[PDB]
A paper describes a structure:
Microbes are protected from the cytoplasmic accumulation of environmental fluoride ion (F-) by export of the toxic anion via fluoride channels known as Flucs. These small, homodimeric ion channels are remarkable proteins in two regards: first, their unusual ‘dual-topology’ architecture, in which the two subunits of the homodimer are arranged antiparallel with respect to each other, yielding a double-barreled pair of pores related by twofold symmetry; second, the Flucs stand out among anion channels for their extreme substrate selectivity. In contrast to most characterized families of anion channels, which tend to be non-selective among anions and sometimes poorly discriminate against cations, the Flucs are arguably the most selective ion channels known, with >10,000-fold selectivity against the biologically abundant chloride. The protein possesses two deep, aqueous vestibules with an electropositive character due to an absolutely conserved arginine sidechain and a deeply buried sodium ion at the center of the protein.
In order to probe the role of the anion-coordinating sidechains in more detail, we mutated Fluc-Ec2’s bromide-coordinating Ser81 to alanine, threonine, or cysteine, and also constructed a S81A/T82A double mutant. For all four mutants, we measured fluoride channel activity using either single-channel electrophysiology or bulk liposome efflux experiments, and we solved x-ray crystal structures of the mutants together with Br-. In both cases, the densities shifted away from the channel center toward the external solution, moving about 2 Å closer to the vestibule Arg22s. The hydrogen bond between the fluoride and the vestibule serine seems to be dispensable, and mutant channels with an alanine at the position retain robust fluoride currents.
Residue numbers in the entry:
A (entry chain B): 1 to 125
B (entry chain C), D (entry chain D): 1 to 96
C (entry chain A): 2 to 126
The structure:
């Protein structure tokens, strides 16, 4: 479990650091739907989608690498909690129209990036 | 680097005992604005109330005719770095 | 740099918690993996408590705020795993449990964020 | 610890040139099942087709009378650790 632990911490730190860097640079550019929190959720949705189709065709990959890409990178890169307060803050600010828009774009958009990631590697392979 | 402080605070309409103030929202998610007002001269108790973040105007009532008032506005806003926090104030003086 | 260590330390703890909770519990109910849900609800409760609490302590070191929010809540919650679970249910034709997972994660996280916020708000009043 | 292999594979109805098979779903998210079949005497090409993850029965057609067939089912399933992967098969033999 210790070698598996290093896979989570390493990929997680890279995902968290990426999310923290992208968020502090781009979120304030558009407060009604902070694009940094969106992009890291879209990107993590893309990566996890490619990982879904790629791991299926490479069943002998070391679980160390699979753990570092998904639970580590995508897990540390994406975020549900910051997505929550953003929608909460919009609700408390009476900005319902953008709270609903934030909920839809993240949910619908992450799945599409997951589908895009999955079907692209599937069409390639 | 985006200011959370409101700009262009001004009185748009007045009566001897009331003031209707308006401002430009800052380019953030304001949850509510805090409006404070008091008599500019010396030691009069400054009073304050909140206005929802969607509104950019507010009425100040129960003033005395012919008195100088200092009015300030600041925000309780959300940002990524600071979660919920308060901005600096923008302030004007107005005589009823 | 001191902010980088706050994200890495907080993110590593959050990612480690999500990795352990998800493996132990996701297989218990695969129609809506409860390990992925619990880390998302818990990160919402925390981020809501943090929202109210930090508002009233403006002199708090930003090092602690960044480690609990961008760090812990960011590593702990996940949108990517939430994505593949819904995507997998959609490909499995299990449409009702795909929608249910979307509603329970979104609606459930916003409620825990409210709970964290109002419990602290009601307590200070 | 949760098995992704189907259980209780069996022919539930049979004609001389077709088989109705069924199985118990494993306790995981199955995206689809893969059914394999072919003459047991390893002198025939094995064929494969898929049925959706919601179904638990499948019809095998185009068989020969009085011939021994090997039938297997495995899953393409999602799990947390492995994402999409294929399970080990469950296999039966049946003579038409
Ligand atoms: C479907 C899933 C749901 C999950 C849970 C959602 C929780 C939402 C919390 C909302 O918080 C409240 O929002 C009101 C509305 O924004 C605010 O009212 C304030 O703002 C309003 C809108 O401007 C004014 O009308 C009110 O007078 C003023 O008190 C109020 O302070 C605030 O605490
Ligand atoms: C699924 C559940 C959905 C519903 C969730 C709850 C929504 C209704 C909340 C009612 O209580 C509110 O509490 C706020 C404080 O928490 C008050 O805000 C007042 O004080 C705030 C600051 O504490 C300001 O930001 C507000 O503008 C000001 O109206 C507000 O008046 C009051 O009505
Ligand atoms: C809210 C929108 C989010 C973004 C879009 C996400 C899209 C996710 C589903 C797409 O994947 C397809 O889903 C079909 C439906 O599950 C599957 O059909 C499979 O299963 C069906 C079950 O009825 C059969 O009818 C089909 O023939 C069979 O190909 C198909 O294989 C699969 O590739
Ligand atoms: Br976060
Ligand atoms: Br993940
Ligand atoms: F969350
Ligand atoms: F995602
Ligand atoms: Na995350």
């Amino acid at each position: 479990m210790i070698k598996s632990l290093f896979a989570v911490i390493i990929g997680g730190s890279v995902g968290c650091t990426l999310r923290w860097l992208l968020s502090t640079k781009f979120n304030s550019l558009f407060p009604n739907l902070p694009p940094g929190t969106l992009v890291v959720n879209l990107l993590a949705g893309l990566i996890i989608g490619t990982a879904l189709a790629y791991f299926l065709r490479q069943p002998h990959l070391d679980p160390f690498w699979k753990l570092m890409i998904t639970t580590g990178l995508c897990g540390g890169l994406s975020t549900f909690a910051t997505f929550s307060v953003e929608v909460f803050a919009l609700l408390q600010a009476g900005n319902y129209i953008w709270a609903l828009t934030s909920v839809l774009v993240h949910v619908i958009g992450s799945l599409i990036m997951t589908a895009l990631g999955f079907f692209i590697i599937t069409i390639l392979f | 680097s985006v200011s959370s402080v409101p700009t262009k605070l001004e009185v748009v309409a007045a009566t001897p005992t009331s003031l209707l103030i308006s401002w430009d929202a800052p380019a953030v998610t304001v949850v509510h604005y805090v409006i404070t007002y008091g008599e500019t001269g010396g030691n009069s108790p400054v009073q304050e109330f909140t206005v929802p973040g969607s509104k950019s105007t507010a009425t100040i009532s129960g003033l005395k005719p012919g008195v100088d008032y200092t009015i300030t506005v600041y925000t309780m806003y959300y940002s990524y770095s600071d979660l919920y926090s308060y901005s600096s104030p923008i302030s004007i003086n107005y005589r009823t």
